[PDB]
Symmetry: C3
Amino acid sequence: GSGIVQQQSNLLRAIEAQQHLLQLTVWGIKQGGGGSEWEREISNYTDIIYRLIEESQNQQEKNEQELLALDKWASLWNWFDI
Amino acid sequence: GSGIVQQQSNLLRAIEAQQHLLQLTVWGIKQGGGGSEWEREISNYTDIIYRLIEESQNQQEKNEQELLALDKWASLWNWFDI
Amino acid sequence: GSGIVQQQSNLLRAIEAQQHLLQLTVWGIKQGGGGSEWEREISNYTDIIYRLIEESQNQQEKNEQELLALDKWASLWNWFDI
């Protein structure tokens, strides 16, 4: 239960960070390009996003393991019920 | 249960809206810039995305509260079982 | 249970693909535009993203049906408990 709520937090944060990147990209095309500061912010948000993606992949793996274990536990209590 | 399925709907809609922004940004660079209509659509989708992000943050908070309450309820039925 | 973990996988993959598009768009503005290869990669990732979005919409519908059924089942075992 905690793993899924946690994973949803991970995804939400990722899309918020990605929205910031989108804004910077929109700014970039409006301005016909961006200076070093523009590149700095792009880099900063990119770093944040990759960390969130990495953490989400890790959490995804743990959630699937828990699912597999729960599924197996339930399928045993299925056969034993006959 | 409903809170998580609901939150997944929120996130999905957000990424769909963000995909539209991405397309507009791709169009923008291909065209070497965009007119007022391009800016209008960017603005419209940005508004949609921020509303979805806000709603998702709110839903996230409610899901975590429910988790905390459920966790506490379960941990009490843990101690009482001895 | 599987439907939500599965849907989280769908969303994660979508945001990863969308991150690749973002990078290409950033590259595009830095370079003042992109060649045919740039357009090819944009197209490829766009295709991936739309397939993931489609699959996520489908999974969302199934999750909501399961929720509706579970909710109904629980509300019947509510009335019958009096």
